[PDB]
Design a binder for this molecule. Structure first.
Ligand code: NA
Length: 206
DNA sequence: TGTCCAGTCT
DNA sequence: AAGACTTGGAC
C-alpha cells in the first residue's frame, strides 16, 4: 500500500518497524457493523487488556436475538443483572444504556449517516454521551468508518509503541505521541496499526 | 490458595 | 481530580 511506503520513508526506526511487521493488513471485522455496535465494543475495550475486553464483549454478543447482536431496543430494556454478568462495570452498563437511547433517538447515527460526518463532528457529537471519550470515538473512526488519518494518542498501547519505536526508557506522554506522529499523516491510522503490533515483536521488552 | 495492572468521570 | 471501577494473564 501507499501507507507502508509513506511510513517506511520516515526515518530508520519506521522503515525497520514496517519491515519487521510486514504488509499493512488491518482488522476489518467491524467495517460493515452499525456504529452503536462498534461503540459498545470500544466501551468493552476501555482500560482492560485485550483478552479481558474480548471475553466481556463476546459474552455480550452471545446474549441475544438469534445469535445476532442485541438491538438498541433490547439493550435499553435489558435486565441490569445480565449485563453485570457479562462483566461490565456499573458505570459501563449505564453507558451501554445511554448508547442504546442515543441510537434509538438518532444522536448516534446509522452507518450510512455517520459516513457523511467529519471526524471532528463525530467526536464532538458522540462524546456528549457519558462513558464515551475521545479515544472511544477514535476507535469507531478507525474500526468502523474507515478513517485513515487517526492517531489515538491517549491509547496506552500506542504510547508503548513509541516507547518501543524510539527505544525510550519509560513510557511517553499523550503530548509526545501527538508531537511525533504528525509526520505519519495522512496515514496515521496505518501508523497506529504498526504501533499496536510492537507488543508482539520478539524484540519487545515490558 | 493472591496481587497487580492492562479509559472515563468526577 | 485522585481514585474507583470491571475481568483475566502473569506471576
Ligand atoms: Na463523554
Amino acid at each position: 500500500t501507499k501507507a507502508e511506503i509513506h511510513l517506511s520513508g520516515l526515518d530508520e526506526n519506521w522503515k525497520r518497524l514496517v519491515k519487521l511487521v510486514g504488509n499493512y493488513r488491518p482488522n476489518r471485522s467491524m467495517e460493515k457493523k452499525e456504529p452503536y455496535e462498534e461503540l459498545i465494543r470500544a466501551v468493552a475495550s476501555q482500560q482492560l487488556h485485550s483478552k479481558a475486553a474480548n471475553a466481556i464483549f463476546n459474552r455480550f454478543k452471545s446474549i441475544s436475538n438469534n445469535g445476532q447482536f442485541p438491538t438498541p431496543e433490547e439493550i435499553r430494556d435489558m435486565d441490569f443483572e445480565i449485563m453485570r454478568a457479562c462483566g461490565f462495570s456499573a458505570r459501563k452498563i449505564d453507558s451501554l444504556k445511554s448508547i442504546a437511547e442515543a441510537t434509538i433517538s438518532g444522536l448516534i447515527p446509522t452507518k450510512e449517516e455517520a459516513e457523511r460526518l467529519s471526524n471532528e463532528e463525530l467526536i464532538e457529537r458522540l462524546t456528549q454521551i457519558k462513558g464515551i471519550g475521545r479515544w472511544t470515538v477514535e476507535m469507531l473512526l478507525i474500526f468502523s468508518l474507515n478513517r485513515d488519518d487517526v492517531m489515538p494518542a491517549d491509547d496506552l498501547s500506542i504510547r508503548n509503541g513509541y516507547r518501543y519505536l524510539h527505544r525510550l526508557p519509560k513510557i511517553p506522554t499523550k503530548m509526545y505521541v501527538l508531537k511525533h506522529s504528525e509526520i505519519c499523516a495522512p496515514f496515521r491510522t496505518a501508523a497506529a496499526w504498526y504501533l499496536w503490533k510492537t507488543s508482539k515483536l520478539a524484540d519487545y521488552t515490558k
